[PDB]
Design a protein around this motif. Structure first.
Motif, PDB file in Angstrom:
ATOM      1  N   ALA A 182       0.797  -1.218   0.000  1.00 47.74           N
ATOM      2  CA  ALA A 182       0.000   0.000   0.000  1.00 47.74           C
ATOM      3  C   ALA A 182       0.832   1.272   0.000  1.00 47.74           C
ATOM      4  O   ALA A 182       0.333   2.322  -0.412  1.00 47.74           O
ATOM      5  CB  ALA A 182      -0.926   0.023   1.218  1.00 47.74           C
ATOM      6  N   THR A 183       2.073   1.213   0.488  1.00 52.90           N
ATOM      7  CA  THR A 183       2.858   2.417   0.725  1.00 52.90           C
ATOM      8  C   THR A 183       4.282   2.361   0.192  1.00 52.90           C
ATOM      9  O   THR A 183       4.928   3.415   0.121  1.00 52.90           O
ATOM     10  CB  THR A 183       2.946   2.694   2.235  1.00 52.90           C
TER      11      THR A 183
ATOM     12  N   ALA B  47       1.114   2.272   8.262  1.00 52.85           N
ATOM     13  CA  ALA B  47      -0.331   2.531   8.341  1.00 52.85           C
ATOM     14  C   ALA B  47      -0.629   4.030   8.401  1.00 52.85           C
ATOM     15  O   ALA B  47      -1.563   4.513   7.759  1.00 52.85           O
ATOM     16  CB  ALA B  47      -0.912   1.809   9.557  1.00 52.85           C
TER      17      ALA B  47
ATOM     18  N   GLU C  88      -2.865   5.860   5.624  1.00 50.90           N
ATOM     19  CA  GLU C  88      -4.082   6.544   6.033  1.00 50.90           C
ATOM     20  C   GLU C  88      -4.000   8.020   5.653  1.00 50.90           C
ATOM     21  O   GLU C  88      -4.990   8.608   5.205  1.00 50.90           O
ATOM     22  CB  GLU C  88      -4.298   6.386   7.536  1.00 50.90           C
TER      23      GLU C  88
ATOM     24  N   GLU D 142      -4.914   8.504   2.240  1.00 49.76           N
ATOM     25  CA  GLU D 142      -6.341   8.310   2.002  1.00 49.76           C
ATOM     26  C   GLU D 142      -7.147   9.551   2.353  1.00 49.76           C
ATOM     27  O   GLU D 142      -8.071   9.919   1.610  1.00 49.76           O
ATOM     28  CB  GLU D 142      -6.860   7.110   2.793  1.00 49.76           C
TER      29      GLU D 142
ATOM     30  N   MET E  94      -6.758  10.626  -1.574  1.00 48.07           N
ATOM     31  CA  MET E  94      -7.590   9.674  -2.316  1.00 48.07           C
ATOM     32  C   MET E  94      -9.083   9.956  -2.147  1.00 48.07           C
ATOM     33  O   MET E  94      -9.815  10.136  -3.137  1.00 48.07           O
ATOM     34  CB  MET E  94      -7.275   8.238  -1.899  1.00 48.07           C
ATOM     35  N   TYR E  95      -9.576   9.972  -0.906  1.00 46.96           N
ATOM     36  CA  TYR E  95     -11.027  10.041  -0.751  1.00 46.96           C
ATOM     37  C   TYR E  95     -11.571  11.427  -1.076  1.00 46.96           C
ATOM     38  O   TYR E  95     -12.623  11.521  -1.717  1.00 46.96           O
ATOM     39  CB  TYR E  95     -11.452   9.590   0.650  1.00 46.96           C
TER      40      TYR E  95
ATOM     41  N   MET F 105     -11.813  11.488  -4.818  1.00 46.89           N
ATOM     42  CA  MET F 105     -12.945  10.678  -5.245  1.00 46.89           C
ATOM     43  C   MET F 105     -14.270  11.369  -4.948  1.00 46.89           C
ATOM     44  O   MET F 105     -15.222  11.252  -5.729  1.00 46.89           O
ATOM     45  CB  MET F 105     -12.888   9.313  -4.557  1.00 46.89           C
TER      46      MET F 105
ATOM     47  N   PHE G 210     -17.870   9.124   0.235  1.00 48.98           N
ATOM     48  CA  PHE G 210     -16.421   9.281   0.175  1.00 48.98           C
ATOM     49  C   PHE G 210     -15.930  10.320   1.185  1.00 48.98           C
ATOM     50  O   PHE G 210     -14.835  10.179   1.746  1.00 48.98           O
ATOM     51  CB  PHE G 210     -16.006   9.677  -1.241  1.00 48.98           C
TER      52      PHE G 210
ATOM     53  N   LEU H 239     -15.811   8.718   4.535  1.00 46.98           N
ATOM     54  CA  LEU H 239     -14.653   7.846   4.641  1.00 46.98           C
ATOM     55  C   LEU H 239     -13.370   8.660   4.780  1.00 46.98           C
ATOM     56  O   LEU H 239     -12.469   8.260   5.511  1.00 46.98           O
ATOM     57  CB  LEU H 239     -14.590   6.909   3.439  1.00 46.98           C
TER      58      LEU H 239
ATOM     59  N   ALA I 230     -13.206   9.345   8.311  1.00 46.77           N
ATOM     60  CA  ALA I 230     -12.897   8.141   9.071  1.00 46.77           C
ATOM     61  C   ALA I 230     -11.420   7.794   8.992  1.00 46.77           C
ATOM     62  O   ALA I 230     -10.824   7.384   9.995  1.00 46.77           O
ATOM     63  CB  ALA I 230     -13.736   6.961   8.574  1.00 46.77           C
ATOM     64  N   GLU I 231     -10.815   7.910   7.790  1.00 45.13           N
ATOM     65  CA  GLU I 231      -9.400   7.572   7.656  1.00 45.13           C
ATOM     66  C   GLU I 231      -8.526   8.577   8.398  1.00 45.13           C
ATOM     67  O   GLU I 231      -7.428   8.234   8.851  1.00 45.13           O
ATOM     68  CB  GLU I 231      -8.990   7.506   6.180  1.00 45.13           C
TER      69      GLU I 231
ATOM     70  N   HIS J 231      -8.600   7.365  11.873  1.00 45.96           N
ATOM     71  CA  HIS J 231      -7.679   6.236  11.978  1.00 45.96           C
ATOM     72  C   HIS J 231      -6.226   6.695  12.026  1.00 45.96           C
ATOM     73  O   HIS J 231      -5.420   6.180  12.803  1.00 45.96           O
ATOM     74  CB  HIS J 231      -7.834   5.288  10.792  1.00 45.96           C
TER      75      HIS J 231
ATOM     76  N   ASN K 178     -13.538   4.546  -9.395  1.00 45.97           N
ATOM     77  CA  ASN K 178     -13.044   4.906  -8.062  1.00 45.97           C
ATOM     78  C   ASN K 178     -13.616   3.972  -6.993  1.00 45.97           C
ATOM     79  O   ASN K 178     -12.919   3.617  -6.043  1.00 45.97           O
ATOM     80  CB  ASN K 178     -13.395   6.350  -7.730  1.00 45.97           C
TER      81      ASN K 178
ATOM     82  N   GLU L 125      -9.549  -0.722   0.487  1.00 42.81           N
ATOM     83  CA  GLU L 125     -10.122  -1.095   1.785  1.00 42.81           C
ATOM     84  C   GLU L 125      -9.944  -2.581   2.049  1.00 42.81           C
ATOM     85  O   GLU L 125      -9.700  -2.994   3.195  1.00 42.81           O
ATOM     86  CB  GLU L 125     -11.609  -0.723   1.864  1.00 42.81           C
TER      87      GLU L 125
ATOM     88  N   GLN M 172      -7.522  -4.592   1.006  1.00 40.71           N
ATOM     89  CA  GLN M 172      -6.128  -4.809   1.379  1.00 40.71           C
ATOM     90  C   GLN M 172      -5.812  -4.230   2.742  1.00 40.71           C
ATOM     91  O   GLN M 172      -4.968  -4.778   3.467  1.00 40.71           O
ATOM     92  CB  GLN M 172      -5.207  -4.190   0.322  1.00 40.71           C
TER      93      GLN M 172
ATOM     94  N   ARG N 139      -3.925  -6.167   5.605  1.00 42.64           N
ATOM     95  CA  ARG N 139      -2.673  -5.652   6.161  1.00 42.64           C
ATOM     96  C   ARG N 139      -2.770  -5.429   7.668  1.00 42.64           C
ATOM     97  O   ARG N 139      -1.862  -5.792   8.432  1.00 42.64           O
ATOM     98  CB  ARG N 139      -2.302  -4.349   5.457  1.00 42.64           C
ATOM     99  N   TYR N 140      -3.864  -4.816   8.120  1.00 42.16           N
ATOM    100  CA  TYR N 140      -3.959  -4.504   9.544  1.00 42.16           C
ATOM    101  C   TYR N 140      -4.076  -5.773  10.374  1.00 42.16           C
ATOM    102  O   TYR N 140      -3.571  -5.832  11.501  1.00 42.16           O
ATOM    103  CB  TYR N 140      -5.141  -3.581   9.804  1.00 42.16           C
TER     104      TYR N 140
ATOM    105  N   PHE O 187      -0.575  -7.032  10.603  1.00 43.06           N
ATOM    106  CA  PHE O 187       0.130  -6.229  11.598  1.00 43.06           C
ATOM    107  C   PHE O 187      -0.307  -6.597  13.020  1.00 43.06           C
ATOM    108  O   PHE O 187       0.513  -6.623  13.952  1.00 43.06           O
ATOM    109  CB  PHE O 187      -0.118  -4.727  11.354  1.00 43.06           C
TER     110      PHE O 187
ATOM    111  N   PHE P  25      -5.055  -2.402  15.814  1.00 45.98           N
ATOM    112  CA  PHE P  25      -5.088  -2.835  14.417  1.00 45.98           C
ATOM    113  C   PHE P  25      -6.372  -3.617  14.138  1.00 45.98           C
ATOM    114  O   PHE P  25      -6.963  -3.487  13.063  1.00 45.98           O
ATOM    115  CB  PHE P  25      -3.874  -3.682  14.052  1.00 45.98           C
TER     116      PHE P  25
ATOM    117  N   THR Q 274      -9.409  -1.120  13.996  1.00 49.27           N
ATOM    118  CA  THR Q 274      -9.359  -0.355  12.754  1.00 49.27           C
ATOM    119  C   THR Q 274      -9.741  -1.235  11.573  1.00 49.27           C
ATOM    120  O   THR Q 274     -10.516  -0.817  10.708  1.00 49.27           O
ATOM    121  CB  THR Q 274      -7.969   0.227  12.564  1.00 49.27           C
TER     122      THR Q 274
ATOM    123  N   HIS R 141     -16.113  -0.147   5.519  1.00 46.43           N
ATOM    124  CA  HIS R 141     -15.892   0.677   4.329  1.00 46.43           C
ATOM    125  C   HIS R 141     -15.973  -0.161   3.056  1.00 46.43           C
ATOM    126  O   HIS R 141     -16.646   0.214   2.085  1.00 46.43           O
ATOM    127  CB  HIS R 141     -14.536   1.351   4.407  1.00 46.43           C
TER     128      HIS R 141
ATOM    129  N   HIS S 294     -18.689   0.087  -0.128  1.00 46.87           N
ATOM    130  CA  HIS S 294     -18.329   0.228  -1.538  1.00 46.87           C
ATOM    131  C   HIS S 294     -18.985  -0.862  -2.373  1.00 46.87           C
ATOM    132  O   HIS S 294     -19.496  -0.600  -3.465  1.00 46.87           O
ATOM    133  CB  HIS S 294     -16.818   0.124  -1.761  1.00 46.87           C
TER     134      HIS S 294
END
Ligand SMILES: [Co+2]
Ligand SMILES: [Co+2]
Ligand SMILES: [Co+2]
Ligand SMILES: [Co+2]
Lengths: 139, 139
Positions: A70-71, A85, A89, A92, A96-97, A100, A116, A119, A122-123, A126, B11, B19, B21, B25-26, B29, B45, B48, B55, B59
């Motif tokens: 992801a990163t 993470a 986040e 996001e 991203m959101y 979108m 969106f 979210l 929310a991110e 997080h 999107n 979301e 992934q 991932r979390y 972790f 983790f 979250t 989420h 979608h």
């Protein structure tokens, strides 16, 4: 043979995304079967979903050598995992959101735009919670 | 406004993949934190990750209007969901994972090639089991 830069790295990332989505899809399907009364089918979606968890986490173990899909960042220890993470986040909720959301509003999907935006918020929550956890990490 | 063909459709698919992934991932972790003894971090983790499940499923709900992101097929009922799972799994075991295995072997990653071959065999088992369930479905 160096995994970084290989086709196999790209394939592990693609297969990790697919297994991840398959688990999410199968649990969604399980909840649909729940409501319908198809309890044997729901249990099967759930058991298969555990398989896809094992598959995704196997892909991820190989990707530890090249970085979080992801990163791009290192992962492994809790400190590294929290760092990656937070970075993801942050992407996001800053990029991203919101982007979108704008596109959805421009295309006339007002409810999806508000989703969106929910979210993004929310991110951000997080990211801030993970940052608080990293601040307190004793390792 | 028609969701099919829009940027917002793409999107939603991209965000669903992300979301999905993120939850995988979390939870990975969380398992690392488990072993390290970082139980508060593991619990975070996991909490979250539950958010990312909500989420991703939100979608997916919007994507019901256009089709399963894995296959293009309609989804919602258990009959539809099983059919889509079967089609996607069939692609994974006949084409995707065998092809990734060959590329990995060609590039010198023997263990990863064997892993992809293990997963091709696993997805074939999944596809056959879902097909058996679909034949037994009473709706
Ligand atoms: Co799988
Ligand atoms: Co999040
Ligand atoms: Co999320
Ligand atoms: Co499968």
């Amino acid at each position: 043979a160096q995994l970084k830069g290989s086709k196999t790295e790209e394939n592990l990332k693609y297969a990790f995304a697919g297994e991840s989505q398959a688990n999410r899809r199968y649990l969604y399907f399980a909840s649909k079967a729940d409501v319908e009364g198809q309890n044997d089918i729901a249990a099967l979606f759930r058991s298969t979903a555990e398989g896809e968890t094992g598959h995704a986490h196997g892909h991820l173990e190989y990707l530890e050598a090249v970085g979080d899909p992801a990163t791009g960042l290192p992962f492994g220890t809790s400190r590294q995992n929290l760092q990656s993470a937070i970075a993801g986040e942050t992407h996001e909720y800053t990029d991203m959101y919101p982007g979108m959301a704008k596109t959805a509003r421009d295309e006339g999907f007002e409810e999806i735009a508000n989703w969106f935006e929910t979210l993004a918020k929310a991110e951000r929550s997080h990211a801030n919670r993970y940052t608080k956890a990293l601040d307190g990490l004793v390792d």
